[PDB]
């Protein structure tokens, strides 16, 4: 059968501030769910937040862009927002919030296809970054041979792969192919705040093999991302899937979306597969570092069993040291490019109150001046 | 009396990928030899997986290579797989799958002996690895007189032990004694695709003191491999045994049975001696890095008192640390050998396939022409 | 009110091996000493383990060397041997056994005295070493400037404190005053297998502030020891008695009694103060490393508020893998002094079987005949 | 002005062992090129060690393979042998020795181009490693954007370059061009032993980029390398070329030319560019770990201004202290694989002297006796 | 033709303290040595010191125990004595000091054999030690196959060694031949102050493999070891003798000849070919820690073409480092076991001084008086 896997994410409020979410707004929304598949809007589901975004994951049959599964997740969130988020004035309650929910605020990585007589999926959730945070785990499952061994010893995967890459200032889609296109690919998707790889299909058959959820820049499109992947059996292994993470790279985002940091691959606190609920990881040092979370899953006539947390292991505790020894490194840097971002690529600026406060001078006549300019400011 | 004890492990589906195994499998298990167990098949059990493969240790006095014993875990193993695997679509689900289990997929270690005034044994189960992975622990713990110390200052030891090697290419079996043949052993067991140690005999008496799960290659042959040790008594001492694994010794298998990396020595998430079951670690990055978990028992009449983690204690952290490190500097060279593996001893290739699509020159006749194959190639 | 604290500890079998203990022991004991409480024998208990040694901590009004007191411990260690040890064929079952209990295998540290208006107290027990690993901490919480300030800063220290030292092989006593004695008393607890503090006391008012488990060498002597420290109020701190642990020294026992190793200050894996029972950390590779646990206790009309696990905390993890690196290092010395012990220190040796089979030659007749053996040798 | 750039390179002995030259060694080189200079046979020249390996570097205008330049070589590898290495005895003395020196056992890299208007070039020698050592980091250089950032942001890179690859066991050269060959590229040269790239070219153009020397295996062919590698202006900057150095990946070679370590970026002792002699470094630990140096020069009318030390940076010391621990790591397994080479490829073995005193049992009848022939071992 | 290699070590001054050698010193002894070269006592030398004693090496053909060669050394120890050492008024002037040098405290290392047609040897030097630091080394270099791979893949060296052991106490020479004899070996050359490794021998052929200085205890015997080794072609290479003291063990020595501290492979400060003298490391913290030098040599007609430092390499700074990392954490014991030496070990001790003035109380009149010996120390 066909099956619709769906993650519609959003921030509805914090606690405190953006560091985790209310443990109450994950139970709130998985009731909500469990009421949903009770009338069959949708088959299954599973809930969880990392940092301060709750991602609703469910599957159902009603395809992409579908008005009621997306109105499905509009109003947990608005509930949630209603019932727990301005009750207990979380900090920035409802700010995420007919018929597509896409460019609202809330993100949504979707994916349909003929589930496989296996069906392994992996669900990433990172907070503090844009969805171009994922461009270079992207890139790199799908198309470094130094992190999917597939791409070389197995015949399956030798064609490669297709990389639909959404230019997100002037609304314009690439296709490209890898091995072929892979430096033109980069070209692109080096720059991560413009083009950022949205889907990608196998180019054998065409099958979907990841989505990432991205919007145009309209201000809504640098929002916190989520992101599907589907693995093994002619895509990548679980395994080349979690090595694409393993080096914690920086990340644009972090304190006020206006720094890079090192994404860290965290463990969730908690993962409850009976109660449908996850608890992710807080966000504290300069609101962050930014951290990504993996939770696995086996589909079977659309349900899912899982999650499975899948940075959870002694190997991971290596990178997850590197990345705070690279966030403490980095921090010392304080208010300069490039831990602050690019002025243009900056969520929080102050430049027009300053360049109305502070006097200019030409810089042709002010050479003549200098002199009296200092004496000036000296008396 | 004389006891047998025996494990017999397979994987029949793993959750997801083949990260890890979904615990109703564990418990679907452990119900159906607690039922065994009602009906005096077997004596005492206990259920647990390292990464996707699960282990059934049962006691039992029926002796070696047991037509029942290896049918009760047959059985297990395929319902585990109907009303389970198969349900929940598990990956690889019944993949491991009369009267002899031995060469069919799953491993068998067994020993049969007179059970001592006290009688402490231990089980391991690797995973992402294959039996050649305890040919360096196996050797230093019963050869190595920087691992055990009572080769040295125990006089009970002191003629030492005799190896049974087997070829599993050419089907054919040394016995190889030390201290004496300890550089003809290693000569043999240090390529460890080939020459596996299968058993180990006390020299002193010829008692029983290892059985490592190995059958002739035919594909079958290098299956995650478990282990059974006594220790104690004129057997190394536990400590001793456990040093042997100090040291994450790269070992063959990892990402698709193709790669080399660290044997890091693992903690079960959970060990539970009532309901006889544990649950051991998952594989993550690159599928691994592979794993080895270290559970104790103590025998009384055949029961199994246990069992007990052995390698929870902050000095194996360290040695994970240095696992974690390793896998992460060898994972850097990508696909080339010697962390890829030699052509003839990986489980993946698409060698054929590219021999098929790349036109060969004759080394001699490709000389003259060089300049107009590339002239050719660049127009 | 004058109280007596007693420590009796004994290993009666270990799970497996000498790796810990068996659950149903502790168990077993906290009934016991509840039963004793409820008859008046003693006023409060607590029970608890580290490695393969049960520590029966009592408090009660009976003094020092007290036979109903060393009777009862007796019969607690000899019901759990028959009763659990014994049933589970334990290794070890029994093997540390009136009316004095000293000398007999089982350790025991006790003081008496007069109940202060706050009374701290620490008990310790060590596995895998002797009585003398106590001997560098002791010295330095009661001597040395560097561990406790007190003697510096607090004019209620400034007197010093009073070693009582044992020889332990020719049967002596000595008491040695700090600070003036310092070099006198580290000339002889330098040699820790031979001269080892027992008891100190405070050199103002002759109160005792501590009592280590020690016996005449007789084979009984070197067994694992257990420790009893007061505190505060012209006593060390808490802090400086367990500052006297923070470097972990290398001490001599470990594998087989005969090796030396550093002493890792561990957590408990639970401390459960309603059901009066700790159950502490594992010894693993090569039978150790060595560990030491603390538990903290306050004293009321002679009942133990407690315990208190005084190594779990985040500083002690520096000193927990500092110790976990040197056991590494020092492990690759194998059968080597100083790893190996001095022949006269090891608790195991091959020395008179080698020296049965291994020709000696006269040095002085050899020089002449060098060559023809080597000839015969090598012929 | 076409120039040639030729080394030839040979190992006739060693000081002491396989450990590093005899400095008079290259002193009597550099006079006989000195003097082929004066005669006009050559145009320049340099002459250095890395360990045991005295590289001629020669530029001249006699092309690729010239009997005159190779002959040159010869007689100065001959005259160092008589007069040097055999009178001082040396280890290996002459062991590397009309009218080409291919196959013969000293190795060669030649290229031969148009001198650019600025002509950056750079002479690579590594010692106790196979030609396959510079598989990884040839490609890395030339194919993988992670390394040369040229390949993405120079629009002159964008098309890639051409491959040969020879196999050294059936003597078949294969053309592969990156990017969109680099998965069928890879699934040749991770197999470093057998697939060597020996040239590499520019694909605009079929410009010559690198030439690595590598001969059919007939014992001749696995002798220690070396590289010329001309960057800039269309190929890889010269830091682009180094850092596809700066992983200290995994080589085979090491002790007996039987094992695997690390490739360590080495520096010089001492470069003397007037002398035309640089001093590298020895091999010690295990007759290594392998060592890898790079000398850097510019061409003018074919002298050679140089050599520049270029691992001669702080930041390579970190490369080095990842090689010299990674090294220790792996040391520690010994005898086993994959430290030890697959068997096939190990330049040692004493397999045939095993197998013809240590008797086989063909395993299924050892099945039925193997209590018997237990018992006989004993008894 | 046959020669002789003797070393022959003594320390005649420090300079200052046991910290170095004054230069001239070295001078003086090369200036020595080249008149004796000239009357034709001898065929060639090199001398050099590691901390503050001096070796001189020297080749001849007067055979092992000459007393024209003893008593060239002896000569020219008195001379630097008189001449330098006194006149300086160095620490310990001429304390080292008819007709057989052994014995008198210099130490002496010498083998005769016939010149192989390459003859590649190493002389070391280890000061703050005793000559039983070298049992480790040895031991690894001719019988661990961790260390010396040839033991497994050479087929020249499967027969394995013999090794000569003298007891210093009781006089008495043990042969003792690997591997079949390893434990035996082990358990006599592990207590490393008693049984030392003074010769090594090849089992094929009798030929000597090593020489290390070694005496009676009688105070001389301790002394400041020196060792010769020739290396391959039947003995183990360069590097895996190198690879034996790549472990920086704990050996005996370093302050005052009563601790124990970490052998650390140093680099000699300046080694100059040409006049004759290599110039070792410094002795600083604690008067060490101990070190030894390694200067590698090619023989031809007894010439010494040389010294090559074998340490000096970016590898063996690791092994630095971790020895200097052991040193601080040992030294963190002070006074006590293991740190400090057990008690009849120790060069230094001043346990009769405190014997004598530290009053015993027989352990069981004690008991009873406790109480008043307390109240009148405390009083
Ligand atoms: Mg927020
Ligand atoms: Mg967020
Ligand atoms: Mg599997
Ligand atoms: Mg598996
Ligand atoms: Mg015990
Ligand atoms: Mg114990
Ligand atoms: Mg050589
Ligand atoms: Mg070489
Ligand atoms: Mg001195
Ligand atoms: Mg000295």
Chains 1, 2, 3, 4, 5 share one sequence.
Do not use: C
Request: a negative charge; glycine letters at 8%.
């Amino acid at each position: 059968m066909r099956v619709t896997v769906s993650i519609i994410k959003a921030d509805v409020g914090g606690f405190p501030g953006h560091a985790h979410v209310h443990p109450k707004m994950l139970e709130y929304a998985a009731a909500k769910l469990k009421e949903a598949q009770k009338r069959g809007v949708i088959i299954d589901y599973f809930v969880y937040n990392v940092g301060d975004d709750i991602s609703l994951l469910m599957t159902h049959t009603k395809g992409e862009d579908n008005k009621d599964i997306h109105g499905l997740a509009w109003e947990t969130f608005k509930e949630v927002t209603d019932q727990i988020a301005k009750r207990f004035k979380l900090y920035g309650a409802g700010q995420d919030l007919s018929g597509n929910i896409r460019g609202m605020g809330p993100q949504v990585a979707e994916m349909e296809f003929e589930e496989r007589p296996s069906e392994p999926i992996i669900a990433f959730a990172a907070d503090k970054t844009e969805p171009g945070a994922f461009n270079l785990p992207l890139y790199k499952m799908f198309a470094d041979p130094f992190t999917t061994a597939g791409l070389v010893i197995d015949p399956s995967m030798h064609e490669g792969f297709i990389f639909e890459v959404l230019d997100v200032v002037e609304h314009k889609v690439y296709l490209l192919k890898t091995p072929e296109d892979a430096y033109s690919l980069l070209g692109l998707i080096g720059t991560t705040g413009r083009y950022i790889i949205r889907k990608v299909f196998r180019r054998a058959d065409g099958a979907p093999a990841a989505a990432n959820s991205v919007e145009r820049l309209s201000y809504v499109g640098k929002d916190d991302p989520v992101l599907l992947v589907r693995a093994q059996s002619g895509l990548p292994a679980v395994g080349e899937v979690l090595e694409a993470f393993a080096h914690p790279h920086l990340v644009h985002g972090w304190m006020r979306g206006s720094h890079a940091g090192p994404l860290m691959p965290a463990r969730f606190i908690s993962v409850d597969p009976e109660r449908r609920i996850a608890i992710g990881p807080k966000m504290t040092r300069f609101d962050g570092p930014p951290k990504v979370g993996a939770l696995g899953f086996q589909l079977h006539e659309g349900y899912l069993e899982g999650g499975v947390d899948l940075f959870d292991d002694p190997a991971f505790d290596y990178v997850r040291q590197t990345a705070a020894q690279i966030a403490d490194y980095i921090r010392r840097m304080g208010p300069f490019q490039p831990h602050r971002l690019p002025p243009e690529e900056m969520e929080y600026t102050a430049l027009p109150k300053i360049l109305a406060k502070v006097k200019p001078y030409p810089a042709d006549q002010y050479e003549k001046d200098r002199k009296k300019y200092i004496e000036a400011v000296v008396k």
